[PDB]
Write a protein that binds this ligand. Structure first.
Ligand SMILES: [Mg+2]
Ligand SMILES: [Mg+2]
Ligand SMILES: [Mg+2]
Ligand SMILES: [Mg+2]
Ligand SMILES: [Mg+2]
Ligand SMILES: [Mg+2]
Ligand SMILES: [Mg+2]
Ligand SMILES: [Mg+2]
Ligand SMILES: [Mg+2]
Ligand SMILES: [Mg+2]
Ligand SMILES: [Mg+2]
Ligand SMILES: [Mg+2]
Ligand SMILES: [Mg+2]
Ligand SMILES: [Mg+2]
Ligand SMILES: [Mg+2]
Ligand SMILES: [Mg+2]
Ligand SMILES: [Mg+2]
Ligand SMILES: [Mg+2]
Ligand SMILES: [Mg+2]
Ligand SMILES: [Mg+2]
Ligand SMILES: [Mg+2]
Ligand SMILES: [Mg+2]
Ligand SMILES: [Mg+2]
Ligand SMILES: [Mg+2]
Ligand SMILES: [Mg+2]
Ligand SMILES: [Mg+2]
Ligand SMILES: [Mg+2]
Ligand SMILES: [Mg+2]
Ligand SMILES: [Mg+2]
Ligand SMILES: [Mg+2]
Ligand SMILES: [Mg+2]
Ligand SMILES: [Mg+2]
Ligand SMILES: [Mg+2]
Ligand SMILES: [Mg+2]
Ligand SMILES: [Mg+2]
Ligand SMILES: [Mg+2]
Ligand SMILES: [Mg+2]
Ligand SMILES: [Mg+2]
Ligand SMILES: [Mg+2]
Ligand SMILES: [Mg+2]
Ligand SMILES: [Mg+2]
Ligand SMILES: [Mg+2]
Ligand SMILES: [Mg+2]
Ligand SMILES: [Mg+2]
Ligand SMILES: [Mg+2]
Ligand SMILES: [Mg+2]
Ligand SMILES: [Mg+2]
Ligand SMILES: [Mg+2]
Ligand SMILES: [Mg+2]
Ligand SMILES: [Mg+2]
Ligand SMILES: [Mg+2]
Ligand SMILES: [Mg+2]
Ligand SMILES: [Mg+2]
Ligand SMILES: [Mg+2]
Ligand SMILES: [Mg+2]
Ligand SMILES: [Mg+2]
Lengths: 155, 199, 135, 81, 88, 131
RNA sequence: CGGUAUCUAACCAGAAAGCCACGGCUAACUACGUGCCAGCAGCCGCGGUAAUACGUAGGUGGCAAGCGUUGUCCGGAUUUAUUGGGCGUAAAGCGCGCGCAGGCGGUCUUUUAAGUCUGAUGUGAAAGCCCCCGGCUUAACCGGGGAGGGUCAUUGGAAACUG
RNA sequence: GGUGCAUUAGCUAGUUGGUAGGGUAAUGGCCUACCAAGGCAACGAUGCAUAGCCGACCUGAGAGGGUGAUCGGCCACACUGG
């Protein structure tokens, strides 16, 4: 796993005596083989917050299908105010994506994808929306078995 | 040549040896300037891509307006964009002269191609950007193929890459075939060049 | 909207507003009318030279000038740099750019271009403020 | 081998004139940007030699040389009355 | 006065003419009826291309050549063929 | 069903898929007859049964779910609608999900999918996307 | 044009580098001076005695015979949303009805061919964008061939959908 | 086929059609004598404002948005009116 921090936010709760601050850190974790996950953790110091997120993240792994170093088809993720469409790109074109949507595509091990975030730009929701799109994504052999066909017949 | 300035500090800022291996990073392998012995910093996404374009264009020492132009015409070729963009750079007249061992450094080959000391197919070429093709006899002018500098630069030089055939007796060479992206240094992540030029 | 609702009465986008409205107006004397020409600079004669105080939370004393352009339009400018030779009835060249502190100012006097001169003892950012090479 | 002329069809609208009628021709154009099939209607003038036609008939008209200030079509045949 | 002539192309001090048939009225580089061939006067043995079937079709319709194009149509053996064409 | 019998037929299937129903019935027609059969061919559904009535008869569609209760149809939609019709030239017949789905186009050689519509060099009205 | 392009010989590293940025957006840092003054600013905003934001010097970073500023257009802007948005509380459902034109319209059969799809012929000039070849010492530039581009016309077929 | 305005709703009087003639290279209210009262418009007539049209040019993933300098085609003008 090759964790990459995304945002470190400094939140505060006001108490009768004043304000008590905290740090929330968003971390994306994955290996380049095709598994990726994200997690969040709140603490009182930045190094403490990061450790919690990495521990949390390692329990939410998801799998990405990556035919020919690319995603199979185009999907649109959707979580709350965040929306992100992913579209396959031609070989050697690199990863064309924003801030926190690029982190989950480089960690996942994908090489050639283009995308565009059409909704809000909150980092917490741009990672949920991307992972939601990863769910709707499906390979040819997986579809062929479901429909009782053969991969040759489909294509 | 065109960047008429110090060469060690260019490598030290970027962190790789642009002139072979370790020659300019033996002592003080850190960025130039007042700082550098003090501390380092954290590189952003912009700084990661912009630090690899500068690894190529300072390796061959050609300006930006020419670096960008040759990036577009590599984008009309068969294959992958970054793959093709790096074999065009290897194919300039400067690099081909440097590969054969006629010059110690590209800043010396360029100052050699500039003055007309080399001939391609029996004709003078006074320019360093000549994009040589496959199977062209690269030779030396039959007026200065005895200069001490070029002779001292062959024995003191390295071996020869596979895709060029050279005769130290006849002072001739030729590009037998185009490389396939694994023959050169390959220390540059070519994907960051392509991403950089689309920001 | 439905497709039919959008055939009977289609979509019309909002129109843009220029930030330097006195620069895209020209004049001609024969017809005595204002023309529509976009121009990077204009020149006029400064009628009032002085200072005003900026808005909160800044508190310095900012130098300005009140010029009368070559199309007859009367505008307020700002003199950058440290120290100026401007007086009343001087000829200046002006250009766009709005200073945030000063309320009414929307243009910005270019220094060294006309009767106005460059700043003394400037070493850096010297193409701005228009002063020559010391060497 | 002899070249031909344009021929249309439509509905007589008025006969309030001498030796002429007014046919109307309707077609389904499409809108430029939304691509919806919209009706188009342009109406002509045709030379009625002997006041044959009546209002609301189906007739065919063919192009001729300019016969008057506006009329340049002739009544070729009638179909449904 | 339809006639066949040369229209000048190429860069400065490197002419390249394009054999064309046009009226005597329209500009040198302006509108024409059709293009027939090219003529490169720079390299030593001049390179000239001719249609061989359009030019004869045009000379019959009264399209007299210009001064130079007559020379080009001479070396090509294409203006002799017009002479034997009328006799036959 | 008042303006689109075909959008009604499509939206009944999507409504029944969500609650994981195993069967749905609706009034029949000649064009809804042909759509149901196309689906069966690609294994989107299990079977179609036709029933005679007094007026026009009905139709029963047996929804197909794979093992582990995972839906076979992910979604449908209608492309050419009464308020705006779309017709596709022979080379404009689209690909859905890079061929992982189908498209139902009504060509002059009958109702066909997009796979064999461009194998006959024909086009027509595009009815729906199914994936 | 004009003794112009080009070529050959003798001697010189000798005559030939600036511009703006360094708080973050955004690559790149420390000293001295000033003290809500002088001043900076595209936005967030900086100057009240330790100023990485003002002024100078040192050092760096992007370009380079150029480098910045201003003006104008497209993009980012899904911020007029056909592709591609919305209307309970954020801007947004007429106070409600009767209804002309208009938009849309249940099931089956036969027929037509206006919309729809398809074959052939004519044309959409040259130059320009793109693809393949070649000529200037390369490049820009210049030549040869082609491709693309029309709710385009004439003409022959199909009948699933709208009329 | 390619524009903004309804905070511009009516416009038309050789104007719409016909019978004979004159005129022109040529058909035609193009002009004339007589008869008639037609013709265009919410599918935007009329009026005001603005503008030479195109091949093409800049930007954009595309659909689109903005422009009509250089080069080629067509139009109009030549101090203002006849
Ligand atoms: Mg949703
Ligand atoms: Mg939503
Ligand atoms: Mg990275
Ligand atoms: Mg240059
Ligand atoms: Mg490409
Ligand atoms: Mg590209
Ligand atoms: Mg705006
Ligand atoms: Mg305004
Ligand atoms: Mg400004
Ligand atoms: Mg009409
Ligand atoms: Mg000669
Ligand atoms: Mg010497
Ligand atoms: Mg400054
Ligand atoms: Mg700053
Ligand atoms: Mg400073
Ligand atoms: Mg410096
Ligand atoms: Mg520098
Ligand atoms: Mg837009
Ligand atoms: Mg808006
Ligand atoms: Mg919409
Ligand atoms: Mg909205
Ligand atoms: Mg409102
Ligand atoms: Mg409200
Ligand atoms: Mg209500
Ligand atoms: Mg009402
Ligand atoms: Mg009704
Ligand atoms: Mg129906
Ligand atoms: Mg039917
Ligand atoms: Mg052309
Ligand atoms: Mg052009
Ligand atoms: Mg060449
Ligand atoms: Mg060319
Ligand atoms: Mg060509
Ligand atoms: Mg039939
Ligand atoms: Mg039928
Ligand atoms: Mg038939
Ligand atoms: Mg209807
Ligand atoms: Mg029918
Ligand atoms: Mg226009
Ligand atoms: Mg008459
Ligand atoms: Mg006349
Ligand atoms: Mg009368
Ligand atoms: Mg009336
Ligand atoms: Mg009306
Ligand atoms: Mg007017
Ligand atoms: Mg006017
Ligand atoms: Mg005008
Ligand atoms: Mg866009
Ligand atoms: Mg375009
Ligand atoms: Mg346009
Ligand atoms: Mg212009
Ligand atoms: Mg001019
Ligand atoms: Mg004409
Ligand atoms: Mg004219
Ligand atoms: Mg005239
Ligand atoms: Mg005059």
């Amino acid at each position: 796993l090759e964790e990459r921090v995304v945002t470190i936010n400094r939140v505060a709760k006001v108490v009768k005596g004043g304000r008590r601050f905290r740090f929330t850190a968003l971390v994306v974790v994955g290996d380049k083989n095709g598994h990726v996950g994200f997690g969040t953790g709140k603490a009182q110091e930045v190094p403490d917050a990061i450790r919690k997120a990495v521990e949390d993240a390692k329990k939410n792994m998801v799998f990405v299908p990556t035919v020919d170093t690319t995603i199979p088809h185009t999907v649109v993720g959707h979580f709350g105010g965040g929306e992100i469409l992913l579209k396959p790109a031609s070989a050697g074109s690199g990863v064309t994506a924003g801030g926190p949507v690029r982190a989950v595509l480089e960690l996942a091990g994908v090489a050639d994808v283009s995308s565009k975030s059409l909704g809000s730009n909150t980092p917490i929701n741009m990672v949920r929306a991307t992972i939601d799109g990863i769910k709707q994504l499906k390979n040819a052999e997986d579809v062929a078995k479901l429909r009782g066909k053969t991969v040759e017949e489909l294509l | 040549a065109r960047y008429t300035g110090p060469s060690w500090k260019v490598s030290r800022r970027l962190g790789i040896s642009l002139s072979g291996t370790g020659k300019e990073l033996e002592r003080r392998p850190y960025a130039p300037g007042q700082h550098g012995p003090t501390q380092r910093k954290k590189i952003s996404e912009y700084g990661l891509q912009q630090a690899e374009k500068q690894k190529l264009r300072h390796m061959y020492g050609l300006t930006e307006r020419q670096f960008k132009n040759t990036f577009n015409k590599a984008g009309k070729l068969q294959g992958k964009h970054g793959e093709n963009f790096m074999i065009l750079l290897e194919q300039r007249l400067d690099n081909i002269v440097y590969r054969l061992g006629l010059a110690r450094t590209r800043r010396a080959a360029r100052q050699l191609v500039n003055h007309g000391h080399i001939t391609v197919d029996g004709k003078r070429v006074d320019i360093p950007s000549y994009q040589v093709s496959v199977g062209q006899v690269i030779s030396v002018r039959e007026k200065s193929a005895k200069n001490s500098a070029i002779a001292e630069s062959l024995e003191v030089s390295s071996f020869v890459p596979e895709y060029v055939t050279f005769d130290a007796e006849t002072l001739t060479g030729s590009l037998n075939r185009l490389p396939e992206r694994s023959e050169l240094a390959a220390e540059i992540n070519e994907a960051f060049i392509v991403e950089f030029y689309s920001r | 909207p439905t497709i039919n609702q959008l055939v009977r009465k289609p979509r019309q986008s909002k129109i843009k507003k220029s930030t330097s409205p006195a620069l895209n107006k020209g004049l001609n004397s024969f017809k005595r009318e204002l023309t529509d020409v976009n121009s990077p600079q204009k020149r006029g004669v400064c009628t009032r030279v002085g200072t005003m105080t900026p808005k909160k939370p800044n508190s310095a004393l900012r130098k300005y000038a009140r010029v009368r352009l070559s199309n007859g339009i009367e505008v307020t400018a700002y003199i950058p740099g440290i120290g100026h030779n401007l007086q009343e009835h001087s000829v200046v060249l002006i250009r766009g750019g709005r200073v945030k502190d000063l309320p009414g100012v929307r243009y910005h006097i270019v220094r060294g271009a006309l009767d106005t001169a460059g700043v003394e003892n400037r070493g850096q950012s010297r193409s701005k403020y228009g002063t020559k090479k010391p060497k | 081998d002899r070249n031909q002329r344009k021929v249309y069809t439509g509905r007589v609208v008025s006969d309030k004139m001498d030796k002429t009628i007014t046919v109307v021709v309707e077609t389904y154009k499409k809108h430029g940007l939304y691509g919806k099939r919209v009706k188009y209607s342009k109406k002509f003038k045709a030379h009625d030699e002997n006041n044959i036609a009546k209002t609301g008939d189906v007739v065919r008209i063919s192009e001729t040389r300019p016969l008057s200030a506006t009329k340049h079509f002739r009544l070729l045949e009638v179909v449904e009355e | 006065a339809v006639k066949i002539r040369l229209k000048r192309m190429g860069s400065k001090k490197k002419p390249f003419y394009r054999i064309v048939v046009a009226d005597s009225r329209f500009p040198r580089d302006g509108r024409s009826i059709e293009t027939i061939g090219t003529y490169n006067p720079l390299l030593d043995p001049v390179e000239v291309k001719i249609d061989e079937e359009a030019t004869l079709k045009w000379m019959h319709n009264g399209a007299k050549p210009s001064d130079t194009v007559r020379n080009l149509l001479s070396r090509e053996g294409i203006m002799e063929k017009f002479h034997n064409q009328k006799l036959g | 069903v008042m303006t689109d019998p075909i959008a009604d037929f499509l939206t009944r299937i999507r409504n029944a898929n969500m609650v994981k129903h195993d069967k749905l019935e609706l009034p029949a027609s000649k064009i809804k007859k042909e759509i149901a059969e196309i689906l069966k061919r690609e294994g989107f559904i299990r079977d179609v049964e036709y029933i005679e009535d007094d007026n026009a008869g009905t139709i029963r569609v047996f929804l197909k779910y794979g093992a582990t209760g995972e839906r076979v149809i992910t979604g449908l939609k209608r492309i050419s609608k009464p308020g705006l019709r779309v017709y596709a030239k022979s080379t404009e017949v689209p690909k859905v999900l890079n061929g992982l789905g189908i498209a139902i186009v009504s060509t002059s050689q009958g109702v066909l999918t997009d796979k064999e519509a461009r194998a006959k060099q024909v086009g027509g009205e595009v009815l729906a996307y199914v994936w």
